[PDB]
Ligand binder design. Sequence first.
Ligand SMILES: CC1=C(/C=C/C(C)=C/C=C\C(C)=C/C=C/C=C(C)/C=C/C=C(C)/C=C/C2=C(C)CCCC2(C)C)C(C)(C)CCC1
Lengths: 165, 175, 154, 95
Amino acid sequence: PENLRWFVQAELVNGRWAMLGVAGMLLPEVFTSIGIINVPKWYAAGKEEYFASSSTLFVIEFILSHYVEIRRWQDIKNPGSVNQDPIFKQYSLPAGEVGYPGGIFNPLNFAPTLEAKEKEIANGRLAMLAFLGFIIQHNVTGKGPFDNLLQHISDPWHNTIVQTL
Amino acid sequence: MPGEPRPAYLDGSAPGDFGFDPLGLGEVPANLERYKESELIHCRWAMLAVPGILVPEALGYGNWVKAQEWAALPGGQATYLGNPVPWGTLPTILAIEFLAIAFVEHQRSMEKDPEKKKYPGGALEELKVKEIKNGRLALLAFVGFCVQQSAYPGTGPLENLATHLADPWHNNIGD
Amino acid sequence: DIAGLTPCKESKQFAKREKQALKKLQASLKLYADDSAPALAIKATMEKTKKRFDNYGKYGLLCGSDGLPHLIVSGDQRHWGEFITPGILFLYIAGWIGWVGRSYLIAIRDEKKPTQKEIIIDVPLASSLLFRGFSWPVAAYRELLNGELVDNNF
Amino acid sequence: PSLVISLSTGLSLFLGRFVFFNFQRENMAKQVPEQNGMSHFEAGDTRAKEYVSLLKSNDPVGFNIVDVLAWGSIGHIVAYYILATASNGYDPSFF
Ligand SMILES: CC1=C(/C=C/C(C)=C/C=C\C(C)=C/C=C/C=C(C)/C=C/C=C(C)/C=C/C2=C(C)CCCC2(C)C)C(C)(C)CCC1
């Protein structure tokens, strides 16, 4: 196969930030209607506020971010972690990282951890295929339609590369 | 070491000898392993330059500043003469205060025991975390803003009416 | 637009010394221009060229005096890529040959007895021995910085 | 528009440091010696120095540097020259 329970969380982390990632531009996703390459921000807002650019929404809300993420890191490292959802186990019942800290140097094994159904996990990756659809168009064809009985599978037009941009 | 491996802010849990079983910094190395001139000096410094600084009033009433208060120092002295000295300004006044200071904590020179630390055993507010342990936050509190005090020295540390400057620069200038 | 070196569009040289350089191959009236090969020294080609004239254009390179591409990336403006946007790949395109290069070799002590076990290549390649080449760094490039190195192996 | 100091203070600053030291205590360190003939380095030996040869004459050292420069140097060229002639021709403080 491949390798050992190295990253799970790393990619899990990734898949966590993922769904709600693809929930992000999933507003442009158009309930019914309101999209394009974005500029704005949830709803509302109107304090004083969340601003530009001698301010930026950036560094303010995302300096402090750091200790909110380092806690996890050092939490991973020196476990550290809930009781225990994400590193790792209590309920119920995901895809097991399974191993404990060392090998024969490395291989007293390495991977008898498959088995089951459709299950929990899946959707975590779903949003990165979403992505590799959803990124690719949006600068290549920057709107997202779906349209039967009209002209699905017919088309209409054409649109390639060098036009210009 | 480096990361992503490290380094036990994640509890222990924790402290911790006992306990529960930990280390954690590696049982007491020293980036000097012996040790000083530059160490703990990073501490009592800026506690006590930064009180000297409270002094510029916010002024809502008026102040400024005294009787003699030096006229930006350049030429309000002395008016001398006797005679007649410097201008003043330049190297001379800037010479007195110096070696006057320059001797005061350098007779201190002679130091070895009485008392050199814990060192092997015992078998400045004595044992003092607080009063001393601030030593840190009293330095960089200062640079923290003197970074902008050497960045954009606009006019008056009104500071925030706008935002938290946060400007942002970007880490570059660009990106 | 930086150091010189103008973006081509003021045309002064390049565009003209061009519509000169290429265009006395064009005076190849000196033959007989209809259908040929034997000749087409005239009509076509310029398609790649003149019918790519004002085309090349077009992203500037701030081609410069002489009127020609002084090709520069260094990490300023759009350019941060005229060789870097096509500057990384190469890094990428090479040293995962190193992986095949490694794991090809790092097999040439496994199944045991080696060398010309290097000349007969055991068609060494097509997937993971290469088709890991795809995915090495920042996900696993630190195949380097643990048990494989050190080195730590035997 | 320049005070030639900093430098020209320090061109004197440690000049004045080895007119310096050591009137009496025999003949001005050690002892004396070393001279010609050669007693020291890779004739054999070649080792092994300390340095606390500072600490003595420092507290002393400061005085003399950082004012005679205002009594010698930037202290007139002095009356005196008297003696007299008068005096060397007696001098304008040059100026
Ligand atoms: C940060 C910084 C920087 C840098 C600089 C320098 C230059 C430094 C030095 C540094 C160091 C300290 C270095 C070292 C390095 C190391 C190395 C080492 C490199 C590399 C490599 C190699 C050689 C590789 C190999 C390989 C791999 C690893 C992968 C692929 C394949 C192979 C296996 C081949 C800059 C520029 C930005 C500037 C500022 C700061």
